Design a protein around this ligand. Structure first.
Ligand SMILES: [Zn+2]
Ligand SMILES: [Zn+2]
Ligand SMILES: [Zn+2]
Ligand SMILES: [Zn+2]
Ligand SMILES: [Zn+2]
Lengths: 228, 230
């Protein structure tokens, strides 16, 4: 139980690459130690920036908010799908139904209430302008999940969370977000911008999703751990 | 993983109508995009750091102390040491954890040292649905339990606890005006948890408190998501 834990959260700020490209959080120093003797900031946060959780409400009219997700869905068995070999050749590589099929043939079945995370070797560009990989028309290019592989995780497993080391569940050039409309409305939640997936084993680890709980929220940054 | 049965959430659901030390809405949400007119829901949160179940970073009461992002991940996973002072707080709403309360816990459950979180269970978490959480008098001074500054001095001198937890608005009790415990614990690169919940559902010892503290760059605090296991 008290084994070795791993941090899976990025350290985000104003320079952190957001989906919209613009900064997603600003700080105002309300009090400083010099004139007041204590420090306090008043933040303005775009809850869908940084290492954050995509609640079902993000893509639904009456889904589950961040506070309504049960605790049983915040402690997930970790199933990391390595596609970084495929992502090296194709920047728009997606976790296809064939990708997770090979995960069974080396680690066994997917446990119930588990989180499926994509390992595309992409959680290392957050320090530069290459994380979004915006094109000449503002079209971002980064790996993601396929909608058909998303629905594959609905019919034949008890997976509850979909995690990605990129900015979105669907890949960059997704003007429709078919993976989002498939995995979120079914009361399953998503995780984006997951860090340090190269430091956890593909199977056996247990994810600890410290999802926020501001009532009525569609998302929000979450401190995520991984008990290896 | 051995003996892992269940995990309990030690976090309150915070909104604009949540009790704060100052007594104002500590968060103002605004839904920018809606599902019907835009296809998806997205809120913009303008919030204070010390709202709901949050963590006071060392920088909260120091000059160059650690910020929320500078707290080591190892210092976030800590053995949980819960001292129950609910019987005392039932009368005086300002009962503090005396150093003798710590010693009685040592003779009962053993030593605190080795990265331990010293949590205080005063039975105040159930008062969030009313004005008893702050318990402010007719004059305006709040009357809630806290940590005795002498107990914080014993934890640094005699133990190796890297964090401590309360179930109200501050580590100091209600009538504190200079915030003694904040000044005697945070500057030493030791963080505190405020507005914790569900401490009545965890054992007094043998539990592991996983603190999901935020890591926004350069912050003195922020709402967190806390859990307890084995
Ligand atoms: Zn999102
Ligand atoms: Zn690999
Ligand atoms: Zn998303
Ligand atoms: Zn505070
Ligand atoms: Zn007791």
């Amino acid at each position: 139980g008290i084994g070795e834990v791993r941090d899976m959260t990025h350290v985000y700020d104003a320079d952190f690459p957001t989906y919209f490209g613009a900064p997603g959080i600003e700080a105002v120093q309300n009090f400083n130690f010099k004139e007041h003797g204590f420090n306090l900031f008043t933040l303005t946060l775009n809850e869908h920036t940084g290492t954050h959780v995509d609640a079902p409400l993000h893509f639904s009219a009456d889904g589950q908010s961040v506070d309504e997700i049960p605790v049983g869905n915040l402690v997930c068995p970790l199933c990391v799908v390595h596609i970084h070999e495929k992502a090296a050749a194709d920047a728009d590589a997606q976790v296809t139904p064939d990708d997770l099929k090979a995960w069974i043939s080396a680690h066994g079945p997917i446990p119930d209430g588990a989180c499926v995370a994509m390992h595309s070797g992409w959680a290392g560009k957050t320090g530069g302008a290459g994380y979004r990989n915006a094109d000449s028309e503002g079209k971002m290019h980064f790996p993601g999940f396929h909608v058909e592989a998303a629905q594959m995780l609905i019919e034949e497993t008890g997976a509850v969370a979909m995690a990605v080391d990129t900015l979105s569940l669907d890949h960059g050039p997704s003007a429709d977000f078919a993976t989002h409309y498939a995995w979120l409305p079914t009361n399953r939640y998503g995780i984006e911008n997951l860090a340090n997936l190269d430091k956890v084993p593909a199977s056996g680890a247990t994810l600890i999703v410290g999802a926020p709980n501001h009532r009525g929220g569609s998302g929000g940054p979450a401190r995520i751990f991984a008990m290896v």
